[PDB]
């Protein structure tokens, strides 16, 4: 019993964490089998982060220019090129404990554990969310650009975040493995802020619905709603639109509590206009929202990976 | 920027981690070196936890009554012995995969990495702290005995705790990995019960001065106190008592913020009298209590000028 926020086992991907310095710019980078993915503003000073023109500063660039350190032992960049915004480092040796791997660009609202890292080493391991507005609520000190964001689905590691910057109000924002933002975000020193942020609503009701597999039934009330009636409420406490495909993705965890997902709608819709009295959910005192449906299955039911 | 419940790096542990299955019960081992550490009750059957006499009942299992499986490979067991609520099983062959590994005792108060393993597979990572009643608030469901609490220094890995056991108030109850439990349980079916938890107090004027670092500050006020007049609040609010030891491990992060510890507690002794109303610090409607003044220097810590 209990319920916690748990993030993947980072084992897989440590063995794929990796240092890269060029000039006097030091970040982490991603070793899958003989390439290093990192991001494009390794290349650039601070004074060159106010307007940096990456194509004419990787051209003065060359290969002997990047030094990559897998831990105790460097690695011999053969190749680079620029994708986007990150840098595809071709080393001469494959990484060894490189796993079965894809690269993913996630929708808002999907959960992955960011593996913190600085100098090539990682430091610590937890559980966040890409919020609706594109930024993540991350914990990243100066040096962690290039450390990754990843799920674990089933037997492969599911890359889908590169950290890049942080935005004025203490946010992040970073890009996929291939390059692209997530947002509209750019890797120029600018004043580009985030937008609003909402909550995002399938995940706080999967969240609802890991309370009552654990014995929590307070918030349960004997109304119903539509899906526009809810939508029209929850609009105006800034919560993300609840889709029909949302309702299917709840479909289970429905069936095994036998609460129906517009009943459990009519739930968070008094939530959302009363509040919660003081009272606690799950051991908080507010709607959490980074629980995807799958994410209350995988401890639910103590899902492994192998 | 930004403040997350971190867990250490677990490569090293799942590269530990293997199944062991005696009679009819499985649950996950240790595995270090030539020797795989697990809970003993491995050995009992249900009459038996009733009133188990485990010297007794080590002495009548053989070699092969054991089956220790890393990942789908048996590890032939040589031999066994016992050290206090730990059983030691000797295999022929030895963890390639060992890392640097100690054996520690942690302090009630403190926290650690739990990664959560069934049939020795691992299912995921997460923090928590050692409650002051010697029990911690985890994730566990059956077959999780075995799984191991660790933190990381540099490159060793200081193992801490063995799950072994939940209670009927829904917390769980284990060993340090010499076999002595936490607290004054006993592996063996009979009633016991939890003692009253009490707030660690110096963890959360950690994450307050977490919350200074990160950019909170509608909490503070002009108000002081001494030792002996907030200890007075603290216990009227089920508070731990703070001593001058914990005093001096604010230190450093009293002087990053300017803020004196005693000046914080007079800022903690308002919230307590007054709640939240309404707002949230950290993204919590509620006082953490699982950050230690190690875990906010950890994330907030920059550089301190002289």
């Known amino acids: ?108 609202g999907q959960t992955f554990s960011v593996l913190a890292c600085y100098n090539g080493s990682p430091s610590g391991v937890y559980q966040c969310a890409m919020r609706p507005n594109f930024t993540i609520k991350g914990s990243f000190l100066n040096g962690s650009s290039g450390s990754v964001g990843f799920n674990i689905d089933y037997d492969c590691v599911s890359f889908c975040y590169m950290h890049h910057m942080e935005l004025p109000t203490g946010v992040h924002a970073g890009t996929d493995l291939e390059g692209n933002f997530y947002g509209p975000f750019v890797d120029r020193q600018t004043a580009q802020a985030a937008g609003t942020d909402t909550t995002i609503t399938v995940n706080v009701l999967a969240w609802l619905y890991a309370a009552v597999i654990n014995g929590d039934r307070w918030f349960l009330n004997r109304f119903t709603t539509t899906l526009n009636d809810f939508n029209l409420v929850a609009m105006k406490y800034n919560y993300e639109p609840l889709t029909q495909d949302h309702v299917d993705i709840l479909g289970p965890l429905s069936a095994q509590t036998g609460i129906a997902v517009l009943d459990m709608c009519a739930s968070l819709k008094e939530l959302l206009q009363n509040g919660m009295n003081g009272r606690t959910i799950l051991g908080s005192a507010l709607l959490e929202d980074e629980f995807t449906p799958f994410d209350v299955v995988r401890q639910c039911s103590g899902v492994t990976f192998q």
């Open 1 to 108: 019993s209990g319920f916690r926020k748990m993030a993947f086992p980072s084992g897989k991907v440590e063995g794929c964490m990796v240092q890269v310095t060029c000039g006097t710019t030091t970040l982490n980078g991603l070793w899958l089998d003989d390439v290093v993915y990192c991001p494009r503003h390794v290349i650039c000073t601070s004074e060159d982060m106010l307007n940096p023109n990456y194509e004419d500063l990787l051209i003065r660039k060359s290969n002997h220019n990047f030094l990559v350190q897998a831990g105790n032992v460097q690695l011999r960049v053969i190749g680079h090129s620029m994708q986007n915004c990150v840098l595809k480092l071709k080393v001469d040796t494959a990484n060894p404990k490189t796993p079965k791997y894809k690269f993913v660009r996630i929708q808002p």
